[PDB]
Amino acid sequence: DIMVPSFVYNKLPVIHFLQEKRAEQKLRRVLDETYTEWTEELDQAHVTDAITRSLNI
Amino acid sequence: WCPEVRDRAELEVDITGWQWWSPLEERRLLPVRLRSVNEVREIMSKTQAKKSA
Amino acid sequence: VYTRWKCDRLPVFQLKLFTQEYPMHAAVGIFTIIFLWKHMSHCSEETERKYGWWAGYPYWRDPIARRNETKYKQMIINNDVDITHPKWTGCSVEQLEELSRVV
Amino acid sequence: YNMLVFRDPKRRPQLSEEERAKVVVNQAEWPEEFKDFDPDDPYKNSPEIIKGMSSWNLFLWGVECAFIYQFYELVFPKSI
Amino acid sequence: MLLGGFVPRRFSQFNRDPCWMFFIFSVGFWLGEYPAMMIKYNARDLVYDPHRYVWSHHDDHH
Amino acid sequence: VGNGPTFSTGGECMNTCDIQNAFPMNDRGVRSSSPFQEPNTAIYDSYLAWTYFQPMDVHIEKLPAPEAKYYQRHTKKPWDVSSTELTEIQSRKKYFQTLGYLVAFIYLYFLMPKEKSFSGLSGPDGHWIMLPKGRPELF
Amino acid sequence: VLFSTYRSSRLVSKEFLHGPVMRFRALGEYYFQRAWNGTLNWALPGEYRLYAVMIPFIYFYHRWHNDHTLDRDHVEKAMIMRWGGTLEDVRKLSAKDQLRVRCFTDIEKLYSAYGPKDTYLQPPGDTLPGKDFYR
Amino acid sequence: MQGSWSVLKKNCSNFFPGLLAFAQQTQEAYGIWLRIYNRQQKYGPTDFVEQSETFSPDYHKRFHSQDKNMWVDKELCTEVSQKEVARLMTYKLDMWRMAHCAGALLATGGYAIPFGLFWLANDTWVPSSFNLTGEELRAWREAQDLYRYRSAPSYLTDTKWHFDFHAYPWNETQERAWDDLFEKNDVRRDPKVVRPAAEMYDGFIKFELIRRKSLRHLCRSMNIPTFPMLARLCNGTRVRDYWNLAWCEDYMVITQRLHESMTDEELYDYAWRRYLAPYDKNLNREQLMERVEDYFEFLGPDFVAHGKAPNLVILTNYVLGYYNDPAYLEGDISELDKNDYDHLASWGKDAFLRRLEFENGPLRDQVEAHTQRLLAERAAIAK
Ligand SMILES: CCCCCCCCCCCCCCCCCC(=O)OC[C@H](COP(=O)([O-])OCC(O)COP(=O)([O-])OC[C@@H](COC(=O)CCCCCCCCCCCCCCCCC)OC(=O)CCCCCCCCCCCCCCCCC)OC(=O)CCCCCCCCCCCCCCCCC
Ligand SMILES: CCCCCCCCCCCCCCCCCC(=O)OC[C@H](COP(=O)([O-])OCC(O)COP(=O)([O-])OC[C@@H](COC(=O)CCCCCCCCCCCCCCCCC)OC(=O)CCCCCCCCCCCCCCCCC)OC(=O)CCCCCCCCCCCCCCCCC
Ligand SMILES: CCCCCCCCCCCCCCCCCC(=O)OC[C@H](COP(=O)([O-])OCC(O)COP(=O)([O-])OC[C@@H](COC(=O)CCCCCCCCCCCCCCCCC)OC(=O)CCCCCCCCCCCCCCCCC)OC(=O)CCCCCCCCCCCCCCCCC
Ligand SMILES: CCCCCCCCCCCCCCCCCC(=O)OC[C@H](COP(=O)([O-])OCC(O)COP(=O)([O-])OC[C@@H](COC(=O)CCCCCCCCCCCCCCCCC)OC(=O)CCCCCCCCCCCCCCCCC)OC(=O)CCCCCCCCCCCCCCCCC
Ligand SMILES: CCCCCCCCCCCCCCCCCC(=O)OC[C@H](COP(=O)([O-])OCC(O)COP(=O)([O-])OC[C@@H](COC(=O)CCCCCCCCCCCCCCCCC)OC(=O)CCCCCCCCCCCCCCCCC)OC(=O)CCCCCCCCCCCCCCCCC
Ligand SMILES: CCCCCCCCCCCCCCCCCC(=O)OC[C@H](COP(=O)([O-])OCC[N+](C)(C)C)OC(=O)CCCCCCCCCCCCCCCCC
Ligand SMILES: CCCCCCCC/C=C/CCCCCCCC(=O)OC[C@H](COP(=O)(O)OCCN)OC(=O)CCCCCCC/C=C/CCCCCCCC
């Protein structure tokens, strides 16, 4: 009725702070893993060159 | 309305964890904070370089 | 989530506390209780007269004698004890009658 | 100040001198209970709990109760 | 722990809080019971018990 | 503003406690008395210093109510008792205990006589118990 | 199966005696649930007014008990021993006489170890009754 | 789970059929254990067979060493099949509870009957053989899962709190592993991220140094009877035997890929015996396979290569983390619009409360300025 309640009350703030920090850490890790992938596609000039070769030019 | 804090505190006290201070975990988590935009740019550049390598 | 102190009722928590948290202390306490009631649970009439009364023993009414008288009367009446038996008096009934006629 | 071992708490200043000097005091907005507020006597204008009941009156009430406690048996003695 | 609370500045302020009103009443009782004992136990008509030598606690505890 | 209490402090000053980092610091440099953000926290200096927060009327931009799906967790168990329910139970129990203790205190200090009086006008002188009954062979 | 081991098995409704309980909790919380009411190991509170109220009350009821239940035994013993050795002998006196005797007992209490010793030591040649008066 | 009259009727009706089934299972399990024991004694390492002694460095108390006193029989498939091992494990649990009940009966004579009535009214400590139909078995499994839910969080909190209060991780990867190990079951933990915690804790507390209270919590979470607990080397022996059998079966399954061919119900049972899949979660085959594969990955390549599993304390915490449900939150957010201290409104504010409101209210700056100016003037006048 008295002792364990008081010590739980004492515990509450530090646990709240640590869990807030943990959530911020999770969000930070989520953000840090984001990279824009630029893709590379076959240049059309080689297609234009193969087209010309096929013509026997 | 903050169930996680409640459950952790109750469990810690019930298993003889009376102390209310956690210096080591705080030391691990104290400097945590959301990064600035410039820091995000630097980290993204590092990740792009790593992926290219 | 489950905790003994928050979820269990008081008797259950008491048993758990003194069986899986402080069993040795409970054992020692029970040992000491047995010792106390085995060796420190008696007081003679003289001890009561010397120290057993707040302001002192009231000899002018002698409550200890009245208490013992009630005790012995109750025992005699309930157990049907013949206090005139030779073992209690050390003499035969006829000798007792002779003594009564003499005195 | 103190009343025996009971010391009156004092609020710590939070403003710096520069910021404090720029504060404009307007006691017209203050409650009537706290005007000309003095840290050494903050309850000078505080209302009485019971109108007309002075501290001396309560002290005297206790004194009279003590006198009754000691003198009632002198006027209405009772047998053992 | 004596951290804070209402503290009257002087006697006249004890009537500004019910708890201190009760306190000053109790102080009145405490201090006023002594004058009453002075008057009662130093009275002219107070007489020692004639039978005070018949019995005393000193002989009882001895 | 009301007269209600706030998050308990234990009479401690959060600017010098061992867990001070857990208490947010405001612009004025006074750490909060609670995990919450407090704008008007102060420190009072008796024999010992202590932090105090005065409730006040302040408007905060209220984010709209979310859906129940994203904050409700239906993991309740038969043994589980919420803090609100525990407070209710303990309040009722302590109310009845207080009444009982009050009656006990009144009887003990104003009605119960002390045992073994010299005059015999008040209190019992004691008596014997567990005496044999219906056992003639015992004597 | 007969009785539950869990506190969650309620025996009454949530609203049973809500009003009186709330008044009781209001009485408890108003002075105690405050920042400056920091206790020392739950026994010594920080609020001054708690001391100011509880010290007098504790003293008052303890003193009433002592005066009317504990010291009364010594007073009655003195009355009985000095005036016959029996309760009926004391009751043969009037209320005024008993008042005088009891107040003399109070005098003896207040002297204790510093008062004159003629209150219990009979000087030689004194004409008052001695210890063998009633024997 | 709490006792009920319906369960009491169920167990009283199936009492004697249950006992007969338990006896038959006892014969079968004795045969299986005899095969396994003969193989262990014949082909086991010298330390394992001789029961080498490992003492703690502080009080020199013997306890089972995971490296020396546990041995994975890689070639057990020749003599004993996977199903037989599962049967033996289930029988070991049932036999432990039955043995405790029989011991109580022998100790207290006929005075245990009312306690037997309390016993049959709950499925927590009755054997699985007492259920003769699917619904009864489902209720029994629900009771077991409820006990696991009740007991596991205390074990996890004990481990985490003691370590965090008395030690910290060495490097960032260990920090991430330790933090992610104790996440609630609503999120998926990556075994590769969490594995380093095993070595980190091996530095702190190996299975040979496990404390008696932590052992009691673990045995509660594993549905192992704990009364009378006695010395920690009895229930510790039970834990070691159970997980040694589990690791033998795990090696068999991993090597032979039996889980892929394993049917849905058998797969669910396999996960359940590893404390990975509660039945109340109503998991499908995809989720069960995901959890089983995560368990195998947590065991790691070294398990197959050398039969060495990670630290048993951390392994138990990892698997029991699936019974660490999110903290319950019931009630609409509108309930936050109410007030908690309306019953105090009638009392108002006393002089001290009014002073505090005045000094620390919106006019606090003006009061501070006035007070400081007055004090400065008085100090100047004094000088
Ligand atoms: C779904 C149903 C809905 C129904 C809706 C109904 C709504 C309408 C109301 C219904 C009617 C009222 C119901 C009852 C209300 C009771 C009061 C109340 O509300 O309390 C709050 C609360 C309400 O319930 P809840 O909050 O919903 O749920 C409770 C929790 O679940 C669990 O609680 P917990 O475990 O946390 O705590 C329980 C208990 C801890 O548990 C126990 O105590 C239970 C076990 C106690 C055993 C004690 C006896 C042991 C004896 C030795 C063993 C003997 C063995 C014999 C074997 C056989 C021999 C042949 O805690 C306490 O002890 C603290 C509280 C104590 C209360 C104060 C009691 C004194 C008040 C006095 C006031 C009056 C003063 C005098 C006035 C005079 C005026 C002139 O009730 C309790 O806490 C229960 C208290 C029970 C105490 C029992 C004590 C018994 C003592 C006397 C025994 C006499 C024996 C005689 C033998 C003779 C032989 C010759
Ligand atoms: C009539 C007089 C009675 C005396 C008073 C008794 C008072 C009650 C105390 C308890 C008595 C025992 C109760 C029955 C237990 C069931 C049998 C048994 O051992 O189960 C195996 C099981 C073994 O447990 P474990 O942890 O796996 O053992 C690790 C070993 O490494 C396991 O070795 P492993 O890993 O190599 O695997 C071997 C396993 C492999 O086997 C299998 O896998 C097949 C299954 C075999 C076991 C089946 C057990 C079935 C249990 C249920 C029975 C049905 C109940 C039906 C109930 C309803 C009836 C209507 O086979 C075993 O379990 C063999 C274990 C060793 C044999 C133990 C028996 C020795 C005593 C009997 C001989 C006495 C001869 C007297 C000669 C007199 C000369 C003057 O026993 C237990 O669960 C332990 C008992 C749990 C309760 C403990 C209570 C405290 C005990 C303190 C005793 C202190 C000394 C006595 C004085 C006390 C004064 C305060
Ligand atoms: C036919 C059947 C088949 C054949 C037989 C087969 C064999 C059967 C036997 C084996 C069965 C094993 C499994 C049993 C499981 C069930 C155990 C159990 O009890 O569960 C709780 C069980 C309910 O279980 P559940 O609802 O299923 O919940 C289970 C959960 O999982 C909750 O689980 P949990 O883990 O939370 O609960 C555990 C809890 C278990 O405990 C409890 O739950 C406590 C139960 C009692 C609570 C009582 C509350 C009510 C009190 C009322 C007081 C009186 C009121 C007024 C009455 C007025 C009457 C006029 O705590 C403990 O485990 C503590 C253990 C403590 C051990 C103590 C050891 C002491 C050793 C001493 C020191 C030695 C040192 C060495 C010295 C060496 C020297 C050389 O509790 C009850 O049902 C309560 C029954 C209350 C009965 C009425 C009150 C007492 C009546 C006494 C009458 C006396 C008459 C004679 C008087 C004569 C006067 C002269
Ligand atoms: C607010 C006021 C309310 C009222 C308050 C009441 C007043 C209380 C005041 C004082 C209370 C504290 C006293 C503490 C004393 C010191 C304790 C201590 O040193 O403990 C050391 C230590 C601590 O225990 P632990 O094993 O470490 O774990 C305890 C945890 O609670 C284990 O927890 P766990 O979570 O690990 O396990 C949970 C679960 C786990 O579940 C299981 O393990 C499965 C089920 C297991 C069933 C039991 C298996 C037993 C196997 C054999 C045991 C050895 C037998 C030895 C020979 C027999 C000796 C008689 O276990 C259970 O549920 C256990 C169920 C037990 C139910 C019985 C509890 C007592 C209720 C009262 C019934 C008796 C009343 C008699 C008096 C009245 C007569 C008219 O105890 C032991 O080593 C256990 C030895 C057991 C020896 C047998 C009992 C000896 C005592 C004499 C029995 C007399 C029987 C009379 C029959 C009727 C005659 C007419
Ligand atoms: C209602 C019934 C009442 C019953 C009363 C009787 C007492 C209770 C009975 C039993 C109760 C159940 C639970 C008991 C405790 C359980 C302990 C436990 O969990 O052990 C697990 C453990 C199993 O684990 P493990 O891994 O297999 O082996 C342990 C590891 O080695 C562990 O490895 P470690 O690294 O820990 O190694 C250390 C380990 C190494 O030890 C062991 O573990 C080995 C087993 C113990 C060996 C003990 C014998 C040592 C050599 C004795 C030499 C004596 C020579 C004297 C010659 C005299 C010539 C004139 O421990 C020691 O070093 C301790 C040594 C013992 C020191 C004794 C000091 C006593 C000082 C005396 C002071 C003065 C007293 C008063 C004055 C007297 C004179 C005027 O069990 C055992 O090892 C054996 C357990 C035996 C249990 C006791 C059996 C009771 C039988 C009772 C028969 C009599 C009944 C009378 C009834 C009367 C009417 C009612
Ligand atoms: C005016 C005079 C003033 C004198 C003041 C003197 C000091 C008094 C101080 C009192 C307060 C402090 C007390 C502290 C505690 C003291 C403890 C103490 O010495 O008690 C010893 C005493 C010794 O008991 P005992 O006195 O009955 O000894 C019996 C010995 N014979 C039969 C030879 C006479 O302990 C008890 O009283 C408790 C006994 C019961 C509990 C223990 C039972 C188990 C015993 C185990 C061994 C024997 C059985 C075999 C093994 C078990 C088999 C199941
Ligand atoms: C188990 C009994 C078997 C024999 C049948 C006896 C029937 C006697 C008639 C009873 C009529 C009144 C019943 C009232 C409802 C009782 C409900 C009950 O048991 O509640 C227990 C409840 C405690 O509740 P919790 O611990 O929170 O947990 C409950 C849920 N798990 O206990 C109470 O509040 C006390 C209620 C006492 C009711 C009266 C019980 C009388 C039992 C008598 C048994 C002996 C035989 C009687 C024969 C009578 C022949 C005419």
Ligand SMILES: CCCCCCCCCCCCO[C@@H]1O[C@H](CO)[C@@H](O[C@H]2O[C@H](CO)[C@@H](O)[C@H](O)[C@H]2O)[C@H](O)[C@H]1O
């Ligand atoms: C009341 C007591 C109750 C006891 C209950 C438990 C009984 C268990 C009995 C198990 C019997 C096993 O039987 C035993 O097995 C071992 C191990 O394979 C055999 O052991 C044999 O092979 C091993 C291994 O190569 C050799 O080290 C050993 O020298 C040789 O004898 C024994 O020859 C056989 O007798």
